[PDB]
Amino acid sequence: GGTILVVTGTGTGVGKTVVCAALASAARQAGIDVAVCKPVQTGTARGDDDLAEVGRLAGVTQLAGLARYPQPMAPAAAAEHAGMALPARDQIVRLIADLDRPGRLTLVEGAGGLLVELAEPGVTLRDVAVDVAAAALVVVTADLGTLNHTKLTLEALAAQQVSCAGLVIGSWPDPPGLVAASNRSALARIAMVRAALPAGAASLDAGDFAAMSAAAFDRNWVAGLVG
Amino acid sequence: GGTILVVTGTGTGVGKTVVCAALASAARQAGIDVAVCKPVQTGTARGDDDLAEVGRLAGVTQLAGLARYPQPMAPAAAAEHAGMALPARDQIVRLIADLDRPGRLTLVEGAGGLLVELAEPGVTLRDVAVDVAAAALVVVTADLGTLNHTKLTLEALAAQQVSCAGLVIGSWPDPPGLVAASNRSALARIAMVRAALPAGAASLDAGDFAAMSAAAFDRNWVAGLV
Ligand SMILES: O=C(O)Cc1ccc(C(=O)[C@@H]2CCC[C@H]2C(C(=O)O)C(=O)O)cc1
Ligand SMILES: O=C(O)Cc1ccc(C(=O)[C@@H]2CCC[C@H]2C(C(=O)O)C(=O)O)cc1
């Protein structure tokens, strides 16, 4: 197969979706075939659709989903409120494996944070990464409190020997304050920061978003993701 | 000795200080001698002295601390901005051990979340809990995202065999709402929910805060702490 990369975050609303679109756009511009997967999507009644947003920002047409739940809550609670059930652990893995192909970068965007239950009992994106032997890209913020959450997430990855592909700051302000600048330097000592997307990147058009994506990441790292 | 409880949280601004005061007030009314220790404190330029708030809200007099930084940043960052290093690991452990005495409940409030550096090099409240053989009370919120942060914190505690004394919701909204009501049920499935302090409890006068605290916690669990 190719390269599978789960994209998680320190929590919800930290920029998982825009980072998936940014990395997808950068990989596409490098000639890499890209598929984006969102196996569990909640909040569809509120209009949330991360796959649709990734295709809007990065032009990705190879988009794969599985479970969709109306309420903007945890998958376990959103499924319970709709009378539905969570998908099986093997259903999520099968969805990802069918996308895997040589020369392709497959991004698997989680729901919420790393330890969110995606399947019963207590199956998380961390367990999924072990099943498909994928490294983990962790989206973080630059705000107060990000250092604790980033350390907690990377320690959880190491507990199951899930490699950390690095960090991405979901929103980087201009200009940065004392806290944001201090956080970015401290985050760089925790792990390698692959990119810091400028604030409001999700509001850019396709042209501006592609230029931002190509400049946000190191092309040597993006090209090295897929052989 | 007595009972040492470190009081951490899933992050910053989750209610660690008001929970320390609430548990201190409930334990005092149960006849338990209470000491509160905030070894490292930041953001004092804004005027936040967490020990002073604990003394005003719960009436605790044994209030111990080692360092106060004015900048509202992480202890390591605020220390670097002021050009002054953090306390030593032995300073924090020995201060807490000297506070501990039979019949006393000693609460150790951390700065920020569990894995925040409180002493060089990279010493956290989790390391301190191991040295003083203390269990951990985890302050959580009721908002969206608390489930992942709580699970991450509890896993970090278990990774160092630090026992979890339960959870406390730092601010219970009114009206709760769908997410908050669902989170409270899910949090109880993860760990024991010792209390959920009502929103705005940090602004109560000393008398009103004492009445809230006595009703927020189970009187039998508080009495069994020492
Ligand atoms: O996780 C991170 O990014 C690192 C980090 C570490 C510590 C804090 C704090 O300590 C806050 C800062 C301002 C006041 C402090 C607050 C209080 O004293 O009321 C608390 O204890 O949480 C915030 C962030
Ligand atoms: O940790 C917790 O308390 C549990 C938890 C679990 C999942 C979510 C989500 O999935 C959010 C809900 C609404 C939109 C979702 C968002 C997106 O779809 O873009 C995301 O994935 O973060 C939020 C909280």
Cα separation, A156 vs B95, in Å, equals 31
Resolution (A): 2.0
Cα separation, A96 vs A6, in Å, equals 10
Which ligand sits nearest to residue B143's alpha carbon?
Answer: 2
Residue given tokens 């609460």 in the structure block: B107
Amino acid at A56: R
Structure tokens given for A75: 């998958």
Burial of A14-26, coded b for 16+ CB within 10 Å and e otherwise, reads: bbbbbbbbbbbbb
Phi-psi region of A31 (alpha: psi -120 to 50; beta: other; left: phi over 0): left
- The technique is X-ray
Which is the catalytic residue, given A2, A35, A38, A110?
Answer: A38
Cα separation, A74 vs B9, in Å, equals 21
Residue given tokens 């004392």 in the structure block: A178
Q: What does the DSSP assignment read for chain A?
A: --EEEEEEESSSSSSHHHHHHHHHHHHHHTT-EEEEEEEEE--GGGT--HHHHHHHHH----EEEEEE-SSSS-HHHHHHHTT--PPPHHHHHHHHHHH--TTEEEEEE-SSSTT---BTTTB-HHHHHHHHT-EEEEEE-SSTTHHHHHHHHHHHHHHTT--EEEEEEEEE-SS--HHHHHHHHHHHHHS-EEEEEETTGGGS-HHHHHHHHHHHS-HHHHHHH--
Contact assessment for residue A8 and residue A190, using Cβ atoms and an 8 Å cutoff: no
Mutate which of A7, A8, A10, A12 for ligand 2 pocket (most atoms within 8 A of beta carbon): A12
End-to-end CA distance of chain A: 11
Cα separation, A216 vs A174, in Å, equals 15
- Of B217, B11, B24, give the one whose Cα is nearest residue B108: B24
Residue of chain A nearest B125, judged by CA positions: A148
Cα separation, A110 vs A29, in Å, equals 24
Contact assessment for residue A106 and residue A32, using Cβ atoms and an 8 Å cutoff: no
Residue of chain B nearest A12, judged by CA positions: B145
Say whether A151 is catalytic: no
What are the binding residues of B?
Answer: 12-18, 38-42, 50, 109, 145-148, 170, 198-202
Contact assessment for residue A177 and residue A187, using Cβ atoms and an 8 Å cutoff: no
Distance, CA of B89 to chain centre: 19
- Any known ligand binding at A15? yes
Contact assessment for residue B108 and residue B6, using Cβ atoms and an 8 Å cutoff: yes
Residue given tokens 């009378």 in the structure block: A83
The residues, ordered by sequence, that sit 6+ positions from B133 with a Cβ below 8 Å of its Cβ are: B4
Structure tokens given for A203: 């509001």
Of ligand 2's atoms, which has the minimum distance to the CA of residue A17? 19
Beta bridge partners of B123: B119
B147 touches A: beta carbon within 8 Å: yes
Cα separation, B131 vs B70, in Å, equals 28
Do β-strands B117-119 and B123-124 pair in parallel, antiparallel, or remain unpaired? antiparallel
Q: Which run of H or of E encompasses B68?
A: strand B62-68
Ligand 2 proximity of A15 Cβ (cutoff 6 Å): no
Neighbours of A196 (CB within 10 A): 20
Neighbours of A158 (CB within 10 A): 12
Structure tokens given for A26: 């950068």
Q: Which run of H or of E encompasses B164?
A: strand B164-172
Cα separation, A142 vs A173, in Å, equals 8
Cα A42 to ligand 2 centre (Å): 7
Cα A74 to ligand 2 centre (Å): 6
Mutate which of B8, B12, B63, B118 for ligand 1 pocket (most atoms within 8 A of beta carbon): B12
- Of B8, B1, B20, B3, give the one whose Cα is nearest residue B153: B8
- Of B184, B121, B183, B191, give the one whose Cα is nearest residue B158: B191
Cα A112 to ligand 2 centre (Å): 4
Burial of A70-102, coded b for 16+ CB within 10 Å and e otherwise, reads: bbbbbbbbbbbbeeeebbebeebbebbeebeee
Amino acid at B68: R
Cα separation, A53 vs A139, in Å, equals 17
Structure tokens given for B162: 């630090």
Q: How far is CA B69 from CA B16, B44, B49, B123, B127, in A?
A: 18, 6, 10, 18, 22
Contact A179 B73 (CB under 8 A): yes
Distance, CA of B90 to chain centre: 20
Q: Which run of H or of E encompasses B56?
A: helix B50-58
Amino acid at A226: V
Contact assessment for residue A94 and residue A119, using Cβ atoms and an 8 Å cutoff: no
Supply angle C-alpha A114, A44, A129, rounded to 5. Answer: 25
Residue given tokens 């004092």 in the structure block: B44
Cα separation, B108 vs B38, in Å, equals 6
Structure tokens given for B133: 């053989």
- Crossing angle for the helix pair B75-82 and A178-190, to the nearest 10 degrees: 120
The residues, ordered by sequence, that sit 6+ positions from B61 with a Cβ below 8 Å of its Cβ are: B55
The DSSP call for residue B86 is P
